[PDB]
Amino acid sequence: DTRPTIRPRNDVVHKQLSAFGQYVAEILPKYVQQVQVSCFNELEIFIHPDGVIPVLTFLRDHTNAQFKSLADLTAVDVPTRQNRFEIVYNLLSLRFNSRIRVKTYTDELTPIESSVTVYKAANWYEREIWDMFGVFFANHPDLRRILTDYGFEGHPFRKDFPLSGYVELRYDDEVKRVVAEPVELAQEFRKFDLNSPWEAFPAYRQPP
């Protein structure tokens, strides 16, 4: 619609992104599984996990796709899927002033090829993904805990990991050191059920 409340939408960028998505799909039919452009003009390419390195290399070196900047590499944990972890690569093409997202899937066991060869920035991002979610990255130069404690056990950002964790720290005089003890909260984190019983967005309705 119109008026200040509604956000203005640019259709030109939408058309450009759709065309380029088709371009990428045609060039890489072996790996590209699905191409989507969001209504807010964000092209997303879904690729089979085996194509992490080829697709990224194409999107980085190709003359008409000069995405030479790995903006952010992250993971989304959806426990309702067999391949719960979804590895998402956010790219930036300075030459064409555009961005693209490469989304792949992985299990808790299936390794994913490291993209350090494609982007050197991928090192620490993949370390974080392994540390927080537990997605092993094959051929990684140094895959180790980057954010958790040295002796920490478990992957915190997993949806099945408790928010407060399983262990807590304190200083004990008898052992003269900081010791790890089972977590005991003086005030339990009060879970608030806020989801309304009435549907909010008809456009995103999943038919039964």
Partner: protein, 112 residues
């Protein structure tokens, strides 16, 4: 499914033994480096205990990842990335022993 490192359980057991050798040989140095009060036997007993904890695994993929995690802990221990408390965390000391007898649990609390 693509194997992480080992295609078969026998290959995985080879990796497990390699890790066990490294941990077994590192324990004496670790006690010296962090000036731990545990004995070399105690550390090696803990290493064997930790390995035996994950002795029910049958999937080579899971065994591979367990070895990778075991390697990572060894790397931190060798590189002194861990601190004295971190090494001692394996030896739960301050934590009071929780009994297993039903009658004892019955007295202790509402523990299921």
């Amino acid at each position: 499914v693509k194997p992480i490192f080992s295609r078969d359980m026998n290959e995985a057991k080879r990796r497990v033994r390699e890790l066990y050798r490294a941990w077994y040989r590192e324990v004496p140095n670790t006690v010296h480096l962090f000036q731990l009060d545990i004995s070399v036997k105690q550390g090696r007993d803990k290493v064997r205990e930790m390995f035996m904890k994950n002795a029910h695994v049958t999937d080579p993929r899971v065994v591979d990842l367990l070895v990778i995690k075991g390697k990572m802990e060894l790397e931190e221990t060798i590189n002194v990335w861990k601190q004295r408390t971190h090494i001692m965390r394996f030896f739960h000391e301050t934590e009071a022993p929780r009994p297993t007898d039903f009658l004892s649990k019955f007295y202790v609390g509402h523990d299921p």
